[PDB]
Each structure stands twice: as structure tokens, then as C-alpha cells.
């Protein structure tokens, strides 16, 4: 169902490098970042989300309200401005990031005690799995 609250520790990371390549993240950053285990912290209250994604290298925080379009500045990533919109499709949390890159966004959902994240940009898809701590 729709409750994504918790501290979530990465179990699997697939094609993170291709996704970052599609974002044109620089070589040295990609090569370090592809090594790392991530932790995701999600505070969800009704439609209000506060998320922190953490690694030993760099963190990325984004806050949003479901159904409310917002300007996302991807400073720790590819450093672009996108117009993001997060909505529910069934119990899948879907984000479209409109801007320079085509097909850019992500989908996040819970199955049991695991959180699944699919990150897309261009023709690249990264798939992550996290275990609830
Ligand atoms: C590329 C890249 C990273 C990946 C960040 C990502 C992919 C965060 C996704 C946020 C989402 C989907 C929030 C949903 O609640 C980190 C900062 C780890 C290391 C440096 C470069």
C-alpha cells in the first residue's frame, strides 16, 4: 500500500552507472558513486514527503507534496532545474521530471518490507531495492 515511511538500506543497485551516464554526470563522480551503498530516509505525512538519500560520498534531499508541481534543483546530481510532479498510480509513487532530458523521472513503491526505486532518463533505467531497517 501507500505508506513509504522509514529508514531503508540498499540491498541491490542495478545500472546506476547507465542512469548517471544518461544524466551526464562526470566521470570521476560516476565512478565513485557507482561503488556506494545508499540509505534512504522517508518521512511521509499524508501527502507531504521529506526524503533524504544518503551515501558516504554525497547526500540528496528532496521534499514534496503529492500532486503539487515543484521546481527541483538537482544539485548533488547533474545540477539541473526540472519541473517535478509526484503522483500516485495505484500504490506506485510516480515522478515526472520535465526539463532538458527526455523520459526523466522515477517510480517508487513498497512490496512487503522492501522499497523499490526505478530511476529513468533517456533510454536508461536504474533499478534499486532497499530493505526496511
Ligand atoms: C547520482 C548520485 C546520487 C544518487 C541520488 C539519487 C538517485 C536520489 C533519488 C531521490 C529520490 C528518488 C527520492 C524519492 O523519495 C547520490 C547523491 C547518492 C551520490 C552522488 C550522485
Name the residue ranges covered by the structural domains of the chain.
1-133
Instruction: Report the C-alpha gap between 97 and 71 in whole angstroms.
Output: 9
106 lines ligand 1 (CB under 6 A): yes
Please name which of 109, 99, 103, 106 lies closest in space to residue 121, comparing C-alpha atoms: 103
CB half-sphere exposure, 51, CA atoms < 13 A: 18
Within 1-133, strands assigned E span 6-14, 39-45, 48-54, 59-65, 70-73, 81-89, 92-98, 105-111, 114-121, 124-132
- Looking at ligand 1, which residue's alpha carbon is closest to its atom 7? 119
Domain 1-133, what architecture? Beta Barrel (2.40)
The C-alpha cell that represents 62 in the structure block? 528532496
Distance of alpha carbon 99 from alpha carbon 70, whole angstroms: 12
User: Comparing C-alpha atoms, which of 78, 129, 65 is closest to residue 104?
Assistant: 78
Cβ neighbourhood burial of 92 (10 Å; 0-12, 13-18, 19+): middle
Determine if ligand 1 sits within 6 Å of the CB of residue 128. Answer: no
Of 128, 85, 120, the C-alpha closest to 103 is 120
Are residues 99 and 109 in contact, defined by beta-carbon separation less than 8 angstroms?
no
- Residue 32's SS3 state is helix
108 is in an annotated binding site: yes
Per the annotation, does 40 bind a ligand? yes
Count Cα neighbours of 59 within 13 Å in the Cβ-side half-sphere. 8
Q: Which three cell numbers stand for residue 57?
A: 560520498
CB 29 within 8 A of CB 23: no
CA–CA separation, 10 and 40 (whole Å): 8
Amino acid at each position: 500500500t501507500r505508506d513509504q515511511n522509514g529508514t531503508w538500506e540498499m540491498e541491490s543497485n542495478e545500472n546506476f552507472e547507465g542512469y548517471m551516464k544518461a544524466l551526464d554526470i562526470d566521470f570521476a563522480t560516476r565512478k565513485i558513486a557507482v561503488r556506494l551503498t545508499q540509505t534512504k530516509v522517508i518521512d511521509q505525512d499524508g501527502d507531504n514527503f521529506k526524503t533524504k538519500t544518503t551515501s558516504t560520498f554525497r547526500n540528496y534531499d528532496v521534499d514534496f507534496t503529492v500532486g503539487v508541481e515543484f521546481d527541483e534543483y538537482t544539485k548533488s546530481l547533474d545540477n539541473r532545474h526540472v519541473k517535478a510532479l509526484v503522483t500516485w498510480e495505484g500504490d506506485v509513487l510516480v515522478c515526472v521530471q520535465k526539463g532538458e532530458k527526455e523520459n526523466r523521472g522515477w517510480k517508487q513503491w513498497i512490496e512487503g518490507d522492501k522499497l523499490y526505486l526505478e530511476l529513468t532518463c533517456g533510454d536508461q533505467v536504474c533499478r534499486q531495492v532497499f530493505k526496511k531497517k
